[PDB]
Amino acid sequence: TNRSLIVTTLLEEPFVMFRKSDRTLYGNDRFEGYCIDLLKELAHILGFSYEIRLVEDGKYGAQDDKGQWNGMVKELIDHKADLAVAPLTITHVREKAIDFSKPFMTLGVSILYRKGTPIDSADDLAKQTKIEYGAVKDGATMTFFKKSKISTFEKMWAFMSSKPSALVKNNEEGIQRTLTADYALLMESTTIEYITQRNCNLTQIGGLIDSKGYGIGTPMGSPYRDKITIAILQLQEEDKLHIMKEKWWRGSGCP
């Protein structure tokens, strides 16, 4: 009741990153970003402490065809962490196994690609194969496509699940692929927004395919979830999260 909460997370700019330093860092001090700021603010408000640990398999979390979970979702299921502090998408399938705080950020799935394509929608992607496309493996975006019954997205998932190379390990690998190949990444929109201010030859293709939130993950029936939710709620009324988003998204202009 006073012990430090175990926080599971993974590296994802600009939510969670290794901060820069000449010396070798350790413990919580290794980390910085939007999600680290949020965590600090919550811990201040609620008077708790924590130890940050990186999820070993580097995954957000998905269920294989035998109902077995992995990634951060699994860490929460097994109660190996008290919180998942990351851009962890709140979804219907995940809510069957774990709980989430109220949403701290709104986003939707869209498309990341190089500038200068006739392609202007998911429809255009789905009806060709010249431009390859995919998504991060074992996260919310993959799961969305795998479960969709909308024809366009059904065809896209038919393609994705057929190409072994098409699913990337993480956003970073995906972004690198869009820069070095004829490849479009299905990516969440807040990240696209951050990436396209920095890599000036990349852009969002089309609009948002859905609308959903990020939440702090907890094991189902966690005693910390509600107070975190209330803490988040108050930060939001004074627009603290908006400000915090600006701090980590602001910067690099484009020609």
Ligand X SMILES: N[C@H](C(=O)O)[C@@H]1CC[C@@H]1C(=O)O
Binding residues for L-glutamate, by number, are 87, 89, 94, 140-141, 188
9 binds ligand X (CB under 6 A): no
Task: Choose the stretch contacting a copy of itself; rule: CB under 8 A; options: 2-10, 103-111, 157-165, 244-252.
Answer: 103-111
96 binds a copy of itself (CB under 8 A): yes
Tell me if the bond preceding 87 is cis, omega within 30° of 0: no
Other beta carbons within 10 Å of 43: 18
Half-sphere exposure of 53 (CA within 13 A, CB side): 18
Which residue number, 89 or 229, has a Cβ lying nearer to ligand X? 89
Query: How many Å separate Cα 147 from the centre of its chain?
Result: 18
Which secondary-structure segment (H or E) carries 141? Answer: helix 140-147
Other beta carbons within 10 Å of 238: 9
What whole-number distance in Å separates Cα of residue 187 and Cα of residue 248?
18
180 binds K ion (CB under 5 A): no
54 binds, among ligand X, a copy of itself, Cl ion, none (CB under 5 to 8 A by kind): Cl ion
Q: What is the contact mask toward K ion in residues 20 to 49, using x (rule: CB under 5 A)?
A: -x---------------------------x
Entry field: residues in the chain: 255
Task: Choose the stretch contacting ligand X; rule: CB under 6 A; options: 47-55, 95-103, 135-143, 148-156.
Answer: 135-143
List the one residue from 6, 54, 131, 230 that touches a copy of itself (CB under 8 A): 230
